[PDB]
PDB file of C-alpha atoms in Angstrom:
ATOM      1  CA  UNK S   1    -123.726  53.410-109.909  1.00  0.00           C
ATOM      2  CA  UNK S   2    -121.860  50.016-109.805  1.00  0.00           C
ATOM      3  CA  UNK S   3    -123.258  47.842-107.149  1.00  0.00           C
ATOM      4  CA  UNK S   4    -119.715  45.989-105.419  1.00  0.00           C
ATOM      5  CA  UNK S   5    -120.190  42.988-107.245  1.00  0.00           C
ATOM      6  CA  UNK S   6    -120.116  44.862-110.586  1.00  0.00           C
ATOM      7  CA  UNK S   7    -117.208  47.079-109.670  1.00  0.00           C
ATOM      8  CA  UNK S   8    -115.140  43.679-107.820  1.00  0.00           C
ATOM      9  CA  UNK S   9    -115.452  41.613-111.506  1.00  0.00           C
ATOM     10  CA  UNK S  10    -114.834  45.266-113.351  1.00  0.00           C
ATOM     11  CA  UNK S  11    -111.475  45.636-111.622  1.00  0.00           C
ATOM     12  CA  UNK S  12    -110.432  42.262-111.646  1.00  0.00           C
ATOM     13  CA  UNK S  13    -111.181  42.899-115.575  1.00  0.00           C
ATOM     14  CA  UNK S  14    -108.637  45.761-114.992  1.00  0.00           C
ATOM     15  CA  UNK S  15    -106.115  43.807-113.530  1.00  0.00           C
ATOM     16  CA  UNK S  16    -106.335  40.714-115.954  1.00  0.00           C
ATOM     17  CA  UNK S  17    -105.862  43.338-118.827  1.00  0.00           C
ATOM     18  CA  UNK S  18    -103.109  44.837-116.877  1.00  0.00           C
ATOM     19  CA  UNK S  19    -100.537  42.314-116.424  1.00  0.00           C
ATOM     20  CA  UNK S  20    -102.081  40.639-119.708  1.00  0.00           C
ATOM     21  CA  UNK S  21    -100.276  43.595-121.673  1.00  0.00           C
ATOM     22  CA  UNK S  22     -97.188  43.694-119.924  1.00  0.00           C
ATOM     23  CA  UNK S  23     -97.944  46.534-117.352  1.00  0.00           C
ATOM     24  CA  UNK S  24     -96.693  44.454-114.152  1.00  0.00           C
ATOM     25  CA  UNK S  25     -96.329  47.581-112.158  1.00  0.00           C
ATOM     26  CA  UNK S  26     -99.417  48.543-112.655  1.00  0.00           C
ATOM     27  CA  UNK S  27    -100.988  45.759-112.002  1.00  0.00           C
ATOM     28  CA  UNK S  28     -98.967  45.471-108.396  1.00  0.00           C
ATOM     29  CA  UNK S  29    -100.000  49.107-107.521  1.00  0.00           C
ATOM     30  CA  UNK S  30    -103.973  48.468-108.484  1.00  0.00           C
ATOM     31  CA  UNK S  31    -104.041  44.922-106.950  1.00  0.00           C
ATOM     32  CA  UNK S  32    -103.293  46.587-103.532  1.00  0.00           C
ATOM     33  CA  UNK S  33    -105.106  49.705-104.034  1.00  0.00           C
ATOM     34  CA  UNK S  34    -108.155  47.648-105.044  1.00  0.00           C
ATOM     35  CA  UNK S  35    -107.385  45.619-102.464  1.00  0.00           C
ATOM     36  CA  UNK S  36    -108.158  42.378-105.445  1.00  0.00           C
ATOM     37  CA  UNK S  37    -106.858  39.310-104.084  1.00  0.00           C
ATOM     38  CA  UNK S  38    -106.743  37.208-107.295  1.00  0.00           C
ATOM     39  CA  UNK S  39    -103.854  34.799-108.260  1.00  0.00           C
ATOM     40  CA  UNK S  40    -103.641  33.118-111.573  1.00  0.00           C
ATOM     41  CA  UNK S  41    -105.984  30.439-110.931  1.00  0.00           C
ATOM     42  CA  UNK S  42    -109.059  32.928-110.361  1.00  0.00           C
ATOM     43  CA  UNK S  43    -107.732  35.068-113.285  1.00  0.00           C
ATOM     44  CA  UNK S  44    -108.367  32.012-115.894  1.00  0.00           C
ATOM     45  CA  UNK S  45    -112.270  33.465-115.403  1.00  0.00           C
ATOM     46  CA  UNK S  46    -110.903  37.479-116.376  1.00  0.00           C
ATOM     47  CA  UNK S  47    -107.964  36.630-119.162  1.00  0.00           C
ATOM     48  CA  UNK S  48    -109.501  38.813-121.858  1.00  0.00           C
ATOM     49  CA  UNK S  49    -112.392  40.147-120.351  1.00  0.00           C
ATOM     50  CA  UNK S  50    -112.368  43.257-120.831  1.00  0.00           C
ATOM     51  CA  UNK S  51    -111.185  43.358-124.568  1.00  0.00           C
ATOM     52  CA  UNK S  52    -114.015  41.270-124.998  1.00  0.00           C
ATOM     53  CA  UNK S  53    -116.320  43.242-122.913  1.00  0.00           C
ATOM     54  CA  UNK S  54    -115.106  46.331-124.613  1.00  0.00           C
ATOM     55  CA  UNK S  55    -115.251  45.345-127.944  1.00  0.00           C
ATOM     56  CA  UNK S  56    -119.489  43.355-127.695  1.00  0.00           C
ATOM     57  CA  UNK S  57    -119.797  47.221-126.555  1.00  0.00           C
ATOM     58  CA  UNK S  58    -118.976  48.847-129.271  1.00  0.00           C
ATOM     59  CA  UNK S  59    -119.788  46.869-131.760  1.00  0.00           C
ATOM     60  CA  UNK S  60    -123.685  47.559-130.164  1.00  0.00           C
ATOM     61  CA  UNK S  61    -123.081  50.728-130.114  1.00  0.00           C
ATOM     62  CA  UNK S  62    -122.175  51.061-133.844  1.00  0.00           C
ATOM     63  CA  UNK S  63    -125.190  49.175-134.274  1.00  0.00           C
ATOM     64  CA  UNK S  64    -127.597  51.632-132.548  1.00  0.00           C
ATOM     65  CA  UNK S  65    -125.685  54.120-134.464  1.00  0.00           C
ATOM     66  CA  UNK S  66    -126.646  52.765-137.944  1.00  0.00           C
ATOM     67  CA  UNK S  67    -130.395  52.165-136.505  1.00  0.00           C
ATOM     68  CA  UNK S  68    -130.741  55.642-135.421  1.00  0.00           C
ATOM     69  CA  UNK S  69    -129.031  57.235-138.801  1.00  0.00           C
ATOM     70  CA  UNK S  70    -131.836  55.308-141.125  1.00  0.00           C
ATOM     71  CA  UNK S  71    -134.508  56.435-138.450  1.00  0.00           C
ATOM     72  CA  UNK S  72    -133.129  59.948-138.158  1.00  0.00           C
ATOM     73  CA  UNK S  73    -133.433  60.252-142.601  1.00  0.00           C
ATOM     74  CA  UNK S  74    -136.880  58.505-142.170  1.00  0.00           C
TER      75      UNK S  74
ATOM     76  CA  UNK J   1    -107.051  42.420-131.707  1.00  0.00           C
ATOM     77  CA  UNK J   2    -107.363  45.264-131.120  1.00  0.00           C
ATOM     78  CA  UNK J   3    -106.351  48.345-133.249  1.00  0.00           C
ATOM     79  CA  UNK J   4    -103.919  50.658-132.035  1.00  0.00           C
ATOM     80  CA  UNK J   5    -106.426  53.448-132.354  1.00  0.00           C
ATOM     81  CA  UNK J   6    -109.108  51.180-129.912  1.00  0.00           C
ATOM     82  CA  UNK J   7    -106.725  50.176-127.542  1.00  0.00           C
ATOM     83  CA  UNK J   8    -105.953  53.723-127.096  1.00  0.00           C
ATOM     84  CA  UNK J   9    -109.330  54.646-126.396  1.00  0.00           C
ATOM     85  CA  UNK J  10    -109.634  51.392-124.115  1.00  0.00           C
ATOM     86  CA  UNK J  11    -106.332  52.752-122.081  1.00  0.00           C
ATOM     87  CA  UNK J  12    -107.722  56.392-122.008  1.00  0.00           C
ATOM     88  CA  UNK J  13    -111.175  55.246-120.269  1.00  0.00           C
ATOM     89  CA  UNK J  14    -108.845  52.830-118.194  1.00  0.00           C
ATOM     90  CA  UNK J  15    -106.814  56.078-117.071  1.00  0.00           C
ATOM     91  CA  UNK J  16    -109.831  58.350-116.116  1.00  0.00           C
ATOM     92  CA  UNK J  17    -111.635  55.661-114.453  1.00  0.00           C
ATOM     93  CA  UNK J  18    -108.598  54.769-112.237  1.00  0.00           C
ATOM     94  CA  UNK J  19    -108.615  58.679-111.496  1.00  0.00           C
ATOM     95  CA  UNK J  20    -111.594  59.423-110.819  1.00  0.00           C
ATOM     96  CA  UNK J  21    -112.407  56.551-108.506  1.00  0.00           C
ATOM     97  CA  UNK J  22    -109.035  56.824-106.566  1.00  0.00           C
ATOM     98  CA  UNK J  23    -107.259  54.519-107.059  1.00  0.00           C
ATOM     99  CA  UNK J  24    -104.460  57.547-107.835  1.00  0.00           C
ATOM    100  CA  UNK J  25    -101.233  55.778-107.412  1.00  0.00           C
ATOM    101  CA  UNK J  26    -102.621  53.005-109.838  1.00  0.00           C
ATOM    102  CA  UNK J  27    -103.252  55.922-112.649  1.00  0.00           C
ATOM    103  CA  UNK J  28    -100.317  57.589-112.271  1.00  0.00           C
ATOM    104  CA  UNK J  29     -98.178  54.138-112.835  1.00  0.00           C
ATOM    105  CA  UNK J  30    -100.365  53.159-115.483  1.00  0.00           C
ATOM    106  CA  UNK J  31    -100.304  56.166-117.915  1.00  0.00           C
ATOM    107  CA  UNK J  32     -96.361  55.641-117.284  1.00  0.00           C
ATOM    108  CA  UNK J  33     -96.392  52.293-118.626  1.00  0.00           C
ATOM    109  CA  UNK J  34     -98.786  52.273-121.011  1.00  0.00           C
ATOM    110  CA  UNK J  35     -97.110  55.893-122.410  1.00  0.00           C
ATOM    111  CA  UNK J  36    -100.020  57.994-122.116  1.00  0.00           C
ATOM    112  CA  UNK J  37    -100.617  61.669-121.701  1.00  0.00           C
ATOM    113  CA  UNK J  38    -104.073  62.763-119.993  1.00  0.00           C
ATOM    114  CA  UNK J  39    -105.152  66.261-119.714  1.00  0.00           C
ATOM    115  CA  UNK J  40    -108.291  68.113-118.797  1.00  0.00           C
ATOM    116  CA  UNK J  41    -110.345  67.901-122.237  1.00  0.00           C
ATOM    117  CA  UNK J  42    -109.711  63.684-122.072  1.00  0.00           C
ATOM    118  CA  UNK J  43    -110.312  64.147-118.504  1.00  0.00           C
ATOM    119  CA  UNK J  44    -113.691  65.092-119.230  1.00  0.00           C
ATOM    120  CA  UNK J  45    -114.215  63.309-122.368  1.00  0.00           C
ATOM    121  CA  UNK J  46    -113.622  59.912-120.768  1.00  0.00           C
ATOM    122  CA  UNK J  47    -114.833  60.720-117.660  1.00  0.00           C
ATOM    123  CA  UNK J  48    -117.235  57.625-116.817  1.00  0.00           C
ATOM    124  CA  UNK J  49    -116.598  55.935-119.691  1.00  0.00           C
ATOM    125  CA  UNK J  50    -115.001  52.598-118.662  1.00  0.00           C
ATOM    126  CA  UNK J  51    -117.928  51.951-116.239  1.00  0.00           C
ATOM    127  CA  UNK J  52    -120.235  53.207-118.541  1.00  0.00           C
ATOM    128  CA  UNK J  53    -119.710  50.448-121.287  1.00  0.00           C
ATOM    129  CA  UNK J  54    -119.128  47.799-118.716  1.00  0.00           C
ATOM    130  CA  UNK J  55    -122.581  47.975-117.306  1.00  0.00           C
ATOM    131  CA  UNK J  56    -124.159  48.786-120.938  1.00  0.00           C
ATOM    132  CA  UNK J  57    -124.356  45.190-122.668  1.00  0.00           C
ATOM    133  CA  UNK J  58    -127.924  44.410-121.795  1.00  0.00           C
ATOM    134  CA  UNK J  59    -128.661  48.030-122.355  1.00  0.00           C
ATOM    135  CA  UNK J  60    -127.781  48.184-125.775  1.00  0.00           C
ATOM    136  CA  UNK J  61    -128.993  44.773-126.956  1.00  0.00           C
ATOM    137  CA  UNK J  62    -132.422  46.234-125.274  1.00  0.00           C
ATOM    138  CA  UNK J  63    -132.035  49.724-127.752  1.00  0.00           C
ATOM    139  CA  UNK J  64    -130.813  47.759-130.729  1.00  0.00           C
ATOM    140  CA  UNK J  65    -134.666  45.659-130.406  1.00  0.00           C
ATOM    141  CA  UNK J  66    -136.656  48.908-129.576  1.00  0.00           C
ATOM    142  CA  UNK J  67    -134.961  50.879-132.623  1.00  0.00           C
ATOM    143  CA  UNK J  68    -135.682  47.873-135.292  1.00  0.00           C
ATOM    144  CA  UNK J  69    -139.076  47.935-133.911  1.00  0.00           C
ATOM    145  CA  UNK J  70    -139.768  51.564-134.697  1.00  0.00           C
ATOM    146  CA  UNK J  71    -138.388  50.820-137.829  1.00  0.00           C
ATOM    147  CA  UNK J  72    -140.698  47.230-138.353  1.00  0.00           C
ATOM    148  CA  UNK J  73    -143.615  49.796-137.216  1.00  0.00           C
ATOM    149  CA  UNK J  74    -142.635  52.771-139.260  1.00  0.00           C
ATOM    150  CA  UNK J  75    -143.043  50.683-142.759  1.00  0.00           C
ATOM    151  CA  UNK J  76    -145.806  48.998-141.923  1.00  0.00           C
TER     152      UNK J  76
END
């Protein structure tokens, strides 16, 4: 589970990366369906969040990846 | 920035996570404009993903420590 605050900053993520790579109708459609009420003021917190989220992610995962390979040889 | 081959990914777990939490009319626009194609075996290979990874940071860092640790141990 996502507790609401979680999911309310994980869709405003959405929405930032939305309309941040050009998908405007998209982002209309999910704004009301989410029912997000952000305008661009609030969205100066989100621009690039979830690239950037994304990407830390990954980059820990590759990480626990290479840990686990030299632990599984060992 | 991303690669084309990440951002696909990224889209994909956007797509299933837009599914499977309803917001339907939101994934069916999206995999429109961002030209995608899902179908059961992404269905289910992406299924939870997006969430997943954005609840995992913490996690991770946490496994990352444990695993050197067993290593630090393991030559000790």
């Amino acid at each position: 589970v996502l507790s609401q605050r979680q999911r309310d900053e994980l869709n405003r993520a959405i929405a930032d990366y939305l309309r941040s790579n050009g998908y405007e109708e998209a982002y209309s459609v999910f704004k009301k369906e989410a029912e997000l009420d952000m305008n661009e003021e609030l969205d100066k917190k989100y621009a690039g969040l979830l690239e950037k989220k994304w990407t830390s992610v990954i980059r820990l995962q590759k990480k626990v990846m290479e840990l686990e390979s030299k632990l599984n040889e060992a």
